[PDB]
């Protein structure tokens, strides 16, 4: 009887949420940016193509130094590039072939990957001999690890296919905080610029905002119709964008706590695999399954260029921290630097 | 300056790194990766036990050809996002408990979703209709009827292209080929030449299963080669 009245009371609470969200919708981002001058057609050319990977390049991450990359492939290799001189700085052989993510530590000392073995493997670059050794295995997740992003040398947040994000302590190797709330597989993260909040789009058409210290879900954002595959914060950390299998990208505002703009074309019926922002946040780059990466005017929803180039779906995308490039991996095994 | 020296050490390190990726390219192209994908009741555990030398990897070789078979055990039941990792595998070994009538539409619907997936519409399936000895006992008992869970079985006769083992009742052969034809009815209704289905009838005590997969992987590679020539 109490369980019967709780679900309808829960439906009562979201009735206030819908009232509160429409109470603050006095305008539209499509209405305020009507008089903004267009960014114009953005011509981008493949500056470098980084070859070396035997199988699908399934993830990728730039360094803070804006020069080195990392790439993970399903062949079980993990290669640190030097996109300036297209050289392979390292090529870490992974224990498990099936790796679904990778990160480069912001200090640049470490690399972490993991995938279908449910573990996150920290790799140390600055070793004694000069090789790369597995610093730690972070075991404790009950599903495939979908995305792990570093905070410091000693903390890492990991997504999982078991509807759970977690914050680890690399020194000790156990989860310090566990984030629970999602209904389906968690597919992506993005840390805040200030590294106090992070979002997580799962396979339940719903992205949540988390407080890393507090360890609890602050706000949940819905608006998508299918699995959310990519997510990134806006460069000021007051907003983020999400891709999905419903072939749309959405801009959310955290303070307004509702959807702000949608990024769809009638010609697009393929899901978004990756999303990223330029340094100013004026562009929204987005990979697709149709092998392209459409470039969006993030304040006018107008497609403003296309990064065609890839023979297979674009797995990963990434704008460099200085903003002077974008890298795009694919299942054709070729990273491509654009500019 | 020593600016040349740093660049000289970089091309030196890339030269060394690149010559392992060539050695690693040889072994990677050599080995055939397989995805073993069944049910808890299917009895995948006994096919792996018949393979002789998070995600359980089993190695075996036949005629000096290496095979790597992955049992993705450790993920949850929702398999629409890790199934995409295996779009490059040589074949999907599907194991079905042919004796378990209640769950066969689960197996058929799973088979249909793999067949018609965007990212698996070029991966051939080596279907293994396991637990044939249990199906034989179930049919001869006459307690549980296939017609209960499949009303199309009322009007079905053993196909002419049939190779029953001696001492098999005509009853057991109808049931065997009806179950198998339900899978082949899905396989023949789409796919349009990119991928094929290889049904086999496997017991728990059967031994020639590594050979069957070696044979069916050879057929998969042959047909891959001779579609680039537009011959098939």
């Amino acid at each position: 009887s109490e369980l019967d009245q709780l679900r309808q009371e829960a439906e009562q609470l979201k009735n206030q949420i819908r009232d509160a969200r429409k109470a603050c919708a006095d305008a539209t981002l499509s209405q305020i940016t009507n008089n903004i001058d267009p960014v114009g057609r953005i011509q981008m050319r493949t500056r470098r193509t980084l070859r070396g990977h035997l199988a699908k390049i399934y993830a990728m991450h730039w360094g803070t130094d804006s020069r080195l990359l990392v790439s993970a492939s399903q062949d079980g290799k993990l290669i640190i590039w030097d996109s300036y001189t297209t050289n392979k700085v390292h090529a870490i052989p992974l224990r498990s072939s099936w790796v679904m993510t990778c990160a480069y530590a912001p200090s640049g000392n470490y690399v972490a990957c993991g995938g279908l073995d449910n573990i996150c493997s920290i790799y140390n670059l600055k070793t004694r001999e000069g090789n790369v050794r597995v610093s730690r295995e972070l075991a404790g997740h009950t599903g495939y690890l979908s995305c792990c992003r570093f905070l410091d040398d000693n903390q890492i947040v990991t997504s999982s296919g078991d509807t759970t994000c977690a914050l680890w302590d690399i020194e000790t190797g156990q989860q310090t905080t566990t984030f629970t709330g999602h209904t389906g597989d968690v597919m992506s993260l993005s840390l805040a610029p200030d590294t106090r909040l992070f979002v997580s789009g799962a396979c339940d058409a719903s992205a949540k905002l988390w407080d890393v210290r507090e360890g609890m879900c602050r706000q949940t954002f819905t608006g998508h119709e299918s699995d959310i595959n990519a997510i990134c914060f806006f460069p000021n950390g007051n907003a983020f964008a999400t891709g999905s299998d419903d072939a749309t990208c959405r801009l959310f505002d955290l303070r307004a706590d509702q959807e702000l703009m949608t990024y769809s074309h009638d010609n697009i019926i393929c899901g978004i695999t990756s999303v990223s922002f330029s340094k100013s946040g004026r562009l929204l780059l987005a990979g697709y399954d149709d092998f392209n990466c459409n470039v969006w005017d993030a304040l006018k929803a107008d497609r403003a260029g296309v990064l065609a180039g890839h023979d297979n779906r674009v797995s990963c995308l990434g704008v460099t921290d200085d903003g002077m490039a974008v890298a795009t991996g694919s299942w054709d095994s070729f990273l491509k630097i654009w500019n | 300056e020593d600016q040349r020296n740093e660049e000289k050490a970089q091309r030196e390190a890339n030269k060394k790194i690149e010559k392992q990726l060539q050695k690693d390219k040889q072994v990677y192209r050599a080995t055939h990766r397989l995805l073993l994908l069944g049910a808890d009741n299917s009895g995948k555990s006994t096919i792996v036990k018949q393979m002789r030398i998070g995600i359980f990897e089993t190695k075996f070789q036949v005629d000096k050809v290496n095979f790597h078979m992955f049992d993705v055990g450790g993920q949850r039941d929702e398999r629409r996002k890790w199934i995409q990792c295996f779009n490059d595998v040589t074949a999907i070994i599907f194991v079905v408990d042919s004796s378990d009538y209640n769950r066969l539409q689960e197996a058929l619907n799973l088979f249909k979703s793999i067949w018609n997936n965007r990212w698996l519409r070029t991966i051939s399936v080596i279907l293994f209709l396991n637990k044939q000895d249990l199906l034989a006992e179930k049919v001869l008992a006459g307690k549980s009827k296939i017609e209960d869970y499949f009303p199309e079985f009322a009007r079905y006769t053993t196909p002419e292209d049939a190779t029953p083992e001696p001492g098999e009742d005509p009853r057991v052969t109808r049931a065997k080929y009806f179950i198998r034809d339900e899978f082949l009815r899905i396989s023949t209704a789409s796919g349009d030449g990119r991928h094929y289905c290889y049904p086999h009838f496997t017991c728990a005590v059967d031994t020639e299963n590594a050979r069957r997969i070696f044979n069916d992987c050879r057929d998969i590679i042959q047909r891959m080669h001779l579609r680039q020539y537009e011959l098939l």
Epitope: C203, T222, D246, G271 | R76, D77, E78, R79
Partner: nanobody, 128 residues
């Protein structure tokens, strides 16, 4: 938000009639294949029937074929399941499930334990 509110179902004598209705909102109902799944007491979820985006690729499970009809109305954004000549075998909770992604001929984990795009369900019970 993706809402699939179910309707119909209740205590029906054997060989009775029923019509289950799920109302869909927060997505374009015409882009997805809609399914019906049920969970018998003491058993796991089982798939009942599906229907393509257009409404021309209907399939049923063996147990209920010719005995149930599934229909959809894209204008109304609703999905129907006509049930007649019921059995004591048919007592279960009927959930209106939606394919995970749009414009696909494949549905991958509609009958899974924790699925996002499924209804809360209606108890259809058949007895005296």
């Amino acid at each position: 938000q993706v809402q699939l509110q179910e309707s119909g179902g209740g205590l029906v004598q054997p060989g009775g009639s029923l019509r289950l209705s799920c109302a869909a909102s927060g997505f374009t109902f015409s882009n997805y294949k809609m399914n019906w799944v049920r969970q018998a007491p003491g058993k796991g979820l089982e798939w009942v029937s599906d229907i393509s985006q257009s409404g021309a690729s209907i399939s049923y499970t063996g147990s209920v074929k010719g005995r149930f009809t599934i229909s959809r109305d894209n204008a109304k954004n609703t999905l129907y399941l006509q049930m007649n000549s019921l059995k004591p075998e048919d007592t279960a909770v009927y959930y209106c499930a939606r394919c995970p992604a749009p414009f696909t001929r494949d549905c991958f984990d509609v009958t899974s334990t924790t699925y996002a795009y499924r209804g809360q369900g209606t108890q259809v019970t058949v007895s005296s």
